[PDB]
Design an enzyme around this catalytic site. Structure first.
Site, PDB file in Angstrom:
ATOM      1  N   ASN A   9       1.144  -0.779  -0.136  1.00  0.00           N
ATOM      2  CA  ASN A   9      -0.281  -0.261   0.022  1.00  0.00           C
ATOM      3  C   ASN A   9       0.742   1.764  -0.049  1.00  0.00           C
ATOM      4  O   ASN A   9       0.336   2.034  -0.060  1.00  0.00           O
ATOM      5  CB  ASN A   9      -0.873   0.069   1.304  1.00  0.00           C
ATOM      6  N   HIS A  56       2.711   2.292   1.981  1.00  0.00           N
ATOM      7  CA  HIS A  56       3.261   2.721   3.590  1.00  0.00           C
ATOM      8  C   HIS A  56       4.965   1.724   4.571  1.00  0.00           C
ATOM      9  O   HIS A  56       4.556   0.746   3.751  1.00  0.00           O
ATOM     10  CB  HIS A  56       2.237   2.377   4.089  1.00  0.00           C
ATOM     11  N   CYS A 116       6.098   6.802  10.073  1.00  0.00           N
ATOM     12  CA  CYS A 116       6.787   7.554   9.210  1.00  0.00           C
ATOM     13  C   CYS A 116       6.681   7.965   7.050  1.00  0.00           C
ATOM     14  O   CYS A 116       5.957   6.598   6.526  1.00  0.00           O
ATOM     15  CB  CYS A 116       8.071   6.917   8.557  1.00  0.00           C
TER      16      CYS A 116
HETATM   17  C1  LIG Z   1      -1.802   0.971   4.982  1.00  0.00           C
HETATM   18  O1  LIG Z   1      -1.956   1.995   6.351  1.00  0.00           O
HETATM   19  C2  LIG Z   1      -2.280   2.890   5.985  1.00  0.00           C
HETATM   20  C3  LIG Z   1      -3.469   3.618   4.903  1.00  0.00           C
HETATM   21  C4  LIG Z   1      -4.255   4.283   4.841  1.00  0.00           C
HETATM   22  C5  LIG Z   1      -3.706   5.276   5.224  1.00  0.00           C
HETATM   23  C6  LIG Z   1      -2.999   4.959   6.762  1.00  0.00           C
HETATM   24  C7  LIG Z   1      -2.483   4.440   6.965  1.00  0.00           C
HETATM   25  C8  LIG Z   1      -1.641   3.586   8.307  1.00  0.00           C
HETATM   26  N1  LIG Z   1      -0.865   2.411   8.229  1.00  0.00           N
HETATM   27  N2  LIG Z   1      -0.498   3.184   9.994  1.00  0.00           N
HETATM   28  C9  LIG Z   1      -1.158   4.390   9.900  1.00  0.00           C
HETATM   29  N3  LIG Z   1      -1.176   5.136  11.109  1.00  0.00           N
HETATM   30  O2  LIG Z   1      -1.821   4.414   8.873  1.00  0.00           O
END
Ligand SMILES: COc1ccccc1-c1nnc(N)o1
Ligand SMILES: COc1ccccc1-c1nnc(N)o1
Lengths: 264, 265
Positions: free
Chosen positions: A186, A188, A223
């Protein structure tokens, strides 16, 4: 991998790879954390997830890790088969919990255990929320009804409050940045990358003479792929350390944690 | 995994993991490179090693990668089973070569291929050397005698000479440093980390609209765990081609040079 007979937990076997081990020829704690994440994903897929349920997708809600706690008694060696059992539990309206038990496949002995707390968040606004009645009834059919805890003990290390490291830190590793390999599907930063960054500020002499026994990590903020992180560590003592990851510029906290190390 | 019937090659199947895939839900080129390294290690162990021969251990000699060349037609998706076949060949006194063929386990179709050139080096002095007859005779019993090439072709990309990128670079990613996860069991930077660092200077727009088809990487000098690296890229070109350079952040000492070929999605 496969769901157990009752369909309320999942098991998978992994053969430890050459690139997955450190200087002691045993799995790093990052390898263990990636395997925990993998068996958790395989469990969700096996019970029908495309871990977002139908009401969650409708409301743009996701699960995010608030805390990870891992305890290792023996790290599996290169070529060894480790078997991991995982299950999820409802924690009322607070969120959910995923637990894991690691075993040596040959002996059947428990070599490690982990537990993680997850909270509900809106994926667009990043606003945390309590778990609603509708989303809880649709996932309770996949959890054991009676409590099943990897860390049963009342007032154990997995539930300890972690303080904020005060400046100056005893040790530090500055200017840590994620690369494309550190991101998930994704885009992230993978949660395991933060464990690596925490460990970067531990002196090499501790790593050379000690084995990591316990790590507790709180996740406060993400981050971004363009953020820069500083990793701070202070000895609080076995050897125990207090940890802090913060953004390089403004000093905004992203994680806090503690590690416990046993002399080799 | 297992050696084939003739005992001259090795095969292993891998199920692609959730953390091993990128934004397209298929294996990254670093996942592919780690799997190539893993099947190579399992092949060496299966034929008796722990890949140093008895004479190599006596003379403090090791194999080190001089070049890696990988071509991917289809990246395996998350949950897919990929089967990899690997074998080694003697290249006279120059060194050895390890080749790989990647296949989709369900269809049996070739989805990728790779080849790598290895040279002999003294572990302590870092001095490269030719392969002696005593060492060559000790490993020839594990290689096919007739040539078996993953890249047979006459004018193929795996053997092309790579030029040195001239300043100024079109794109750059500065101050790259390895962390403990980037090291191998011998406390050296894993060869796959250098592929990641090369890829860091490719613009995100190319990554979003193209798929990596070919990567050729030359290894000149290693990055120490306390060194800092700069990654430089310049477009040299439907298809997009780039020239790459990794050099130490301070003095500008070359560590790697390479090229990538990308096709539009
Ligand atoms: C795949 O994770 C996300 C997808 C969309 C928005 C936020 C996240 C996220 N992951 N950790 C946090 N604190 O937000
Ligand atoms: C495990 O690798 C080594 C061990 C000892 C000495 C050198 C190396 C090495 N690896 N790549 C290069 N260029 O040297």
């Amino acid at each position: 991998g496969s769901l157990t007979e009752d369909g309320l937990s999942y098991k998978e076997k992994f053969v430890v790879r050459s690139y997955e081990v450190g200087s002691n020829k045993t799995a790093t704690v990052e390898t263990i954390a990636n395997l925990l994440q993998e068996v958790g994903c395989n469990h969700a897929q096996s019970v029908g997830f495309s871990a977002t349920t139908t009401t969650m997708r409708k409301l743009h809600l996701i699960w995010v890790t608030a805390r990870m706690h891992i305890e290792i008694y023996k790290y599996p060696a290169w070529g060894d088969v480790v078997e991991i059992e995982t299950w999820c539990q409802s924690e009322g309206r607070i969120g959910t919990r995923r637990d894991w038990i690691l075993k040596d496949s040959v002996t059947g002995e428990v070599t490690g255990r982990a537990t993680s707390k997850w909270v509900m968040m809106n994926q667009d606004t990043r606003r945390l929320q309590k778990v609603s009645d509708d989303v809880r009834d649709e996932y309770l059919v996949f959890c054991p009804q009676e409590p099943r805890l990897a860390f049963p003990e009342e007032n154990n290390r997995s539930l300890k409050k972690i303080p904020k490291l005060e400046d100056p830190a005893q040790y530090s590793m500055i200017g840590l940045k994620p690369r494309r390999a550190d991101l998930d599907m994704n885009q992230h930063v993978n949660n395991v990358t933060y464990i690596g960054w925490v460990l970067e500020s531990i002196p090499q002499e501790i790593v050379d003479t000690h084995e990591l026994q316990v790590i507790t990590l709180d996740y406060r903020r993400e981050c971004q792929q363009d953020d820069v992180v500083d990793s701070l560590t202070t000895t609080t003592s076995d050897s125990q350390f207090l940890h802090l990851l913060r953004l390089s510029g403004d000093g905004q906290e992203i994680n806090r944690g503690t590690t416990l190390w046993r002399k080799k």
